RNA sequence: GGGGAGCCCUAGCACAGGUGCUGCAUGGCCGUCGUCAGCUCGUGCCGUGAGGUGUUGGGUUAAGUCCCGCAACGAGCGCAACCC
């Protein structure tokens, strides 16, 4: 499934503007663009969804942050079904250092919903 | 009959007074740049740090007025509004 549906439509891309370490995950580089090796993918993927299975089998959440048309749409959609918060918007500065600030904004938006129903 | 009080007279005294200088010792009060849109606070991030950031970028407005971007998210005095 993973390997076989992946060759369905995605793998390698980008014109040789490649970061060193990333190309350790890479086989070939031809036809003009790199070729992703689905092996290391599935390695880091059994690992990934092991991590994800655990963290989801004790409750905790993780984000979906995507801000490029494509990605953007999907994330929010999936997020709603996934429950978890989505960031398809300007990932604002401080969000994960300024928790008290963003929480200010939140409580105020809750208050928007408050003073709106009155 | 005198002493005492508001009460005026004269010497003496402590004093008043002076629109005499000093706005380069000052308050207060007006000017003026100028209704020009300007001066900053808060957590976070960048910078060894002074500090920067926010406020530099584009369209727009009477406007730091609003939008877009965006390492920031906002917040106060200004502009406006509450006043005639």
Coordinates of N, CA, C and O (backbone and C1' of nucleotides) in Angstrom, one line a residue, chain B residues 23-77:
Chain B
rG23 P 18.2 88.4 31.8 O5' 17.3 87.1 31.7 C5' 15.9 87.0 32.2 C4' 15.2 85.7 31.9 C3' 14.9 85.3 30.5 O3' 15.2 84.0 30.2 C1' 13.0 85.2 31.8
rC24 P 15.3 83.4 28.7 O5' 16.8 83.2 28.5 C5' 17.8 84.0 29.2 C4' 18.3 83.3 30.4 C3' 18.7 84.2 31.6 O3' 18.4 83.6 32.8 C1' 20.5 82.8 30.9
rA25 P 18.4 84.4 34.2 O5' 18.5 83.3 35.3 C5' 19.4 82.2 35.1 C4' 19.3 81.2 36.2 C3' 18.0 80.4 36.1 O3' 18.0 79.3 35.3 C1' 18.2 81.3 38.3
rU26 P 16.7 79.0 34.4 O5' 15.6 78.6 35.4 C5' 14.3 78.8 35.1 C4' 13.4 78.7 36.4 C3' 11.9 78.6 36.2 O3' 11.5 77.3 35.8 C1' 12.3 80.2 37.9
rG27 P 10.3 77.0 34.8 O5' 9.0 77.1 35.8 C5' 8.9 76.3 36.9 C4' 7.7 76.7 37.7 C3' 6.3 76.7 37.1 O3' 5.8 75.4 37.1 C1' 6.6 78.7 38.2
rG28 P 4.9 74.8 35.9 O5' 3.8 75.9 35.7 C5' 2.7 76.2 36.6 C4' 2.0 77.4 36.3 C3' 1.4 77.6 34.9 O3' 0.1 77.0 34.9 C1' 2.6 79.5 35.5
rC29 P -0.4 76.3 33.5 O5' -0.4 77.6 32.5 C5' -1.4 78.6 32.6 C4' -1.0 79.8 31.7 C3' -0.8 79.5 30.3 O3' -1.9 79.3 29.5 C1' 0.9 80.9 31.0
rC30 P -1.8 78.4 28.1 O5' -1.2 79.4 27.1 C5' -1.9 79.7 25.9 C4' -1.1 80.8 25.1 C3' -0.4 80.2 23.9 O3' -1.2 80.1 22.8 C1' 1.0 81.6 25.2
rG31 P -1.0 78.9 21.7 O5' 0.4 79.4 21.0 C5' 0.4 80.7 20.4 C4' 1.8 81.2 20.2 C3' 2.6 80.5 19.2 O3' 2.2 80.9 17.9 C1' 4.0 80.8 21.1
rU32 P 1.3 80.0 16.9 O5' 2.4 79.3 16.0 C5' 3.6 79.9 15.7 C4' 4.8 79.0 16.0 C3' 4.7 77.6 15.4 O3' 5.0 77.6 14.0 C1' 5.8 77.6 17.6
rC33 P 3.8 77.0 13.0 O5' 4.4 75.6 12.6 C5' 5.6 75.4 11.8 C4' 6.6 74.5 12.5 C3' 6.2 73.0 12.4 O3' 6.5 72.4 11.2 C1' 7.1 73.6 14.6
rG34 P 5.4 71.4 10.5 O5' 4.0 71.9 11.2 C5' 2.8 71.5 10.6 C4' 1.6 71.8 11.5 C3' 1.5 73.2 12.1 O3' 0.2 73.8 12.0 C1' 1.7 71.6 13.8
rU35 P -1.1 73.2 12.7 O5' -1.5 71.9 12.0 C5' -2.8 71.3 12.1 C4' -2.7 69.8 12.1 C3' -3.8 69.1 11.2 O3' -3.2 68.0 10.6 C1' -4.0 68.3 13.4
rC36 P -3.0 68.0 9.0 O5' -1.4 67.7 8.8 C5' -0.5 68.5 9.5 C4' 0.9 67.9 9.6 C3' 0.9 66.4 9.9 O3' 0.8 65.6 8.7 C1' 2.5 67.5 11.3
rA37 P -0.1 64.3 8.6 O5' 0.7 63.2 9.5 C5' 2.0 62.7 9.2 C4' 2.6 61.9 10.3 C3' 1.9 60.6 10.5 O3' 2.8 59.6 11.1 C1' 1.5 61.9 12.4
rG38 P 4.4 59.5 10.8 O5' 5.1 60.6 11.7 C5' 6.0 60.2 12.7 C4' 5.9 61.1 13.9 C3' 6.3 60.4 15.2 O3' 7.7 60.4 15.4 C1' 4.3 61.4 15.6
rC39 P 8.4 59.2 16.2 O5' 7.9 59.3 17.7 C5' 8.5 60.3 18.5 C4' 8.1 60.0 20.0 C3' 8.6 58.7 20.5 O3' 9.9 58.7 21.0 C1' 6.3 59.0 21.0
rU40 P 10.7 57.4 21.3 O5' 9.9 56.6 22.4 C5' 9.7 55.2 22.5 C4' 8.6 54.8 23.4 C3' 8.4 53.3 23.8 O3' 9.3 53.0 24.9 C1' 6.3 54.2 23.1
rC41 P 9.5 51.5 25.3 O5' 8.1 51.0 25.9 C5' 7.8 51.2 27.3 C4' 6.5 50.5 27.7 C3' 6.6 48.9 27.7 O3' 7.1 48.5 28.9 C1' 4.7 49.6 26.4
rG42 P 8.0 47.1 29.0 O5' 6.9 46.0 28.6 C5' 5.9 45.6 29.5 C4' 5.0 44.5 28.9 C3' 5.6 43.3 28.3 O3' 5.9 42.3 29.3 C1' 4.0 44.1 26.8
rU43 P 7.5 41.8 29.5 O5' 7.5 40.4 28.7 C5' 6.8 39.3 29.3 C4' 6.3 38.3 28.2 C3' 7.3 37.7 27.3 O3' 8.0 36.6 27.8 C1' 5.4 38.6 26.1
rG44 P 9.4 36.2 27.2 O5' 9.2 35.9 25.7 C5' 8.5 34.7 25.3 C4' 8.5 34.6 23.8 C3' 9.8 34.8 23.1 O3' 10.6 33.6 23.1 C1' 8.3 36.2 22.0
rC45 P 12.2 33.6 23.3 O5' 12.7 33.8 21.8 C5' 12.2 33.1 20.7 C4' 12.4 33.8 19.4 C3' 13.8 34.4 19.1 O3' 14.8 33.5 18.8 C1' 12.1 36.0 18.5
rC46 P 16.3 33.8 19.3 O5' 16.8 34.9 18.2 C5' 16.8 34.6 16.9 C4' 17.2 35.8 16.1 C3' 18.6 36.3 16.5 O3' 19.7 35.6 16.0 C1' 17.1 38.1 16.2
rG47 P 21.0 35.4 17.0 O5' 21.4 36.8 17.3 C5' 22.1 37.6 16.3 C4' 22.6 38.9 16.8 C3' 23.4 38.9 18.1 O3' 24.7 38.3 18.0 C1' 21.9 40.6 18.1
rU48 P 25.0 37.0 19.0 O5' 25.3 37.7 20.4 C5' 25.3 36.8 21.6 C4' 26.1 37.4 22.7 C3' 25.6 38.7 23.3 O3' 24.5 38.5 24.2 C1' 28.0 38.8 23.1
rG49 P 23.1 39.1 23.8 O5' 23.1 40.6 24.2 C5' 23.6 41.0 25.4 C4' 24.4 42.3 25.4 C3' 23.6 43.5 25.0 O3' 22.9 44.1 26.0 C1' 25.7 43.4 23.8
rA50 P 21.6 45.0 25.8 O5' 22.1 46.4 25.2 C5' 23.0 47.2 25.9 C4' 23.5 48.4 25.2 C3' 22.4 49.2 24.4 O3' 21.6 50.0 25.2 C1' 24.4 48.9 23.1
rG51 P 20.0 50.0 25.2 O5' 19.6 49.6 23.7 C5' 19.6 50.5 22.7 C4' 19.8 49.8 21.3 C3' 18.5 49.4 20.6 O3' 18.0 50.5 19.8 C1' 20.0 47.6 20.6
rG52 P 16.4 50.6 19.5 O5' 16.3 49.5 18.3 C5' 16.9 49.6 17.1 C4' 17.0 48.3 16.3 C3' 15.6 47.8 15.9 O3' 15.2 48.4 14.7 C1' 16.8 46.0 16.9
rU53 P 13.7 49.0 14.6 O5' 12.8 47.7 14.8 C5' 12.9 46.6 13.9 C4' 12.4 45.3 14.5 C3' 10.9 45.1 14.5 O3' 10.3 44.7 13.3 C1' 12.0 44.2 16.5
rG54 P 9.7 45.7 12.2 O5' 8.6 46.5 13.1 C5' 7.2 46.3 12.9 C4' 6.6 45.6 14.0 C3' 5.6 46.4 14.8 O3' 4.3 46.3 14.2 C1' 7.2 45.5 16.3
rU55 P 3.7 47.6 13.5 O5' 4.9 48.3 12.8 C5' 4.7 49.2 11.7 C4' 5.7 50.4 11.7 C3' 7.1 50.1 11.3 O3' 7.7 51.1 10.6 C1' 7.0 51.0 13.5
rU56 P 7.2 51.4 9.0 O5' 8.5 51.0 8.2 C5' 9.7 51.8 8.1 C4' 10.8 51.1 7.5 C3' 10.6 50.4 6.2 O3' 10.8 51.2 5.0 C1' 11.5 48.8 7.7
rG57 P 10.0 50.9 3.7 O5' 9.8 49.3 3.6 C5' 10.5 48.6 2.6 C4' 9.5 47.7 1.8 C3' 8.2 48.4 1.3 O3' 8.4 49.1 0.1 C1' 7.7 46.3 2.3
rG58 P 7.6 50.4 -0.2 O5' 6.3 49.8 -1.0 C5' 6.4 49.0 -2.1 C4' 5.1 48.3 -2.5 C3' 3.9 49.2 -2.7 O3' 3.9 49.8 -4.0 C1' 3.4 47.4 -1.3
rG59 P 2.8 51.0 -4.3 O5' 1.5 50.2 -4.7 C5' 0.3 50.9 -5.1 C4' -0.9 50.4 -4.5 C3' -1.9 51.5 -4.0 O3' -2.7 52.1 -5.0 C1' -1.7 49.7 -2.4
rU60 P -2.9 53.7 -4.9 O5' -3.7 53.9 -3.5 C5' -5.0 53.4 -3.3 C4' -5.5 53.6 -1.9 C3' -5.5 55.0 -1.4 O3' -6.5 55.8 -1.9 C1' -4.7 53.5 0.3
rU61 P -6.4 57.4 -1.9 O5' -6.6 57.8 -0.4 C5' -7.9 57.6 0.2 C4' -7.9 57.9 1.7 C3' -7.5 59.3 2.1 O3' -8.5 60.2 2.0 C1' -6.3 57.7 3.4
rA62 P -8.2 61.7 1.5 O5' -7.6 62.5 2.8 C5' -6.8 63.6 2.7 C4' -6.3 64.0 4.1 C3' -5.4 63.0 4.8 O3' -4.1 63.0 4.4 C1' -7.0 63.9 6.3
rA63 P -3.2 61.6 4.3 O5' -3.2 61.1 5.8 C5' -2.4 61.6 6.8 C4' -2.6 61.0 8.1 C3' -2.4 59.5 8.3 O3' -1.0 59.2 8.6 C1' -4.5 60.1 9.3
rG64 P -0.2 58.5 7.4 O5' 0.5 57.2 8.2 C5' 0.8 57.3 9.5 C4' 0.2 56.1 10.3 C3' -0.6 56.6 11.5 O3' -1.8 55.7 11.7 C1' 1.1 55.1 12.2
rU65 P -3.1 56.2 12.5 O5' -4.2 56.1 11.4 C5' -5.6 56.3 11.8 C4' -6.5 55.7 10.8 C3' -6.4 54.2 10.5 O3' -7.0 53.5 11.6 C1' -6.5 55.3 8.5
rC66 P -6.4 52.1 12.0 O5' -6.6 51.1 10.7 C5' -7.9 50.6 10.5 C4' -8.1 50.1 9.1 C3' -7.3 48.9 8.6 O3' -7.7 47.6 9.2 C1' -7.2 50.5 6.9
rC67 P -6.6 46.4 9.3 O5' -6.5 45.9 7.8 C5' -7.6 45.3 7.2 C4' -7.3 45.0 5.7 C3' -6.1 44.1 5.4 O3' -6.4 42.7 5.5 C1' -5.9 46.1 4.1
rC68 P -5.3 41.7 6.1 O5' -4.3 41.6 4.9 C5' -4.6 41.0 3.7 C4' -3.4 41.0 2.7 C3' -2.1 40.6 3.3 O3' -2.0 39.2 3.3 C1' -1.8 42.6 2.1
rG69 P -1.4 38.5 4.7 O5' 0.2 38.3 4.4 C5' 0.7 38.1 3.1 C4' 1.9 38.9 2.7 C3' 3.2 38.5 3.6 O3' 3.9 37.4 3.1 C1' 2.9 40.9 3.5
rC70 P 4.2 36.2 4.1 O5' 5.0 36.9 5.3 C5' 6.3 37.5 5.1 C4' 6.7 38.4 6.2 C3' 6.7 37.7 7.6 O3' 7.9 36.9 7.8 C1' 5.5 39.7 7.8
rA71 P 7.9 35.4 8.1 O5' 8.1 35.2 9.7 C5' 9.2 35.9 10.3 C4' 8.8 37.0 11.2 C3' 9.9 38.1 11.4 O3' 9.3 39.4 11.3 C1' 9.1 37.1 13.5
rA72 P 8.2 40.1 12.2 O5' 7.0 39.1 12.1 C5' 5.6 39.5 12.4 C4' 5.0 38.6 13.4 C3' 3.8 39.2 14.1 O3' 2.5 39.0 13.4 C1' 5.3 38.5 15.8
rC73 P 1.4 40.1 13.4 O5' 0.5 39.8 14.7 C5' 0.1 38.4 15.0 C4' -0.1 38.3 16.5 C3' -0.9 39.4 17.2 O3' -2.3 39.3 17.0 C1' 1.0 39.0 18.4
rG74 P -3.0 40.4 16.0 O5' -2.5 41.8 16.5 C5' -3.3 42.7 17.3 C4' -3.0 42.5 18.8 C3' -3.2 43.8 19.6 O3' -4.6 44.0 20.0 C1' -1.1 42.8 20.2
rA75 P -5.1 45.5 20.0 O5' -4.5 46.1 21.3 C5' -4.8 45.6 22.6 C4' -3.9 46.3 23.6 C3' -4.0 47.8 23.7 O3' -5.1 48.4 24.3 C1' -1.7 47.1 23.8
rG76 P -5.7 49.8 23.8 O5' -4.6 50.8 24.5 C5' -4.8 51.3 25.8 C4' -3.8 52.3 26.2 C3' -4.0 53.7 25.6 O3' -5.0 54.5 26.2 C1' -1.7 53.1 25.5
rC77 P -5.7 55.7 25.4 O5' -4.6 56.8 25.3 C5' -4.0 57.4 26.4 C4' -3.0 58.5 26.1 C3' -3.3 59.4 25.0 O3' -4.2 60.4 25.4 C1' -1.1 58.7 24.7

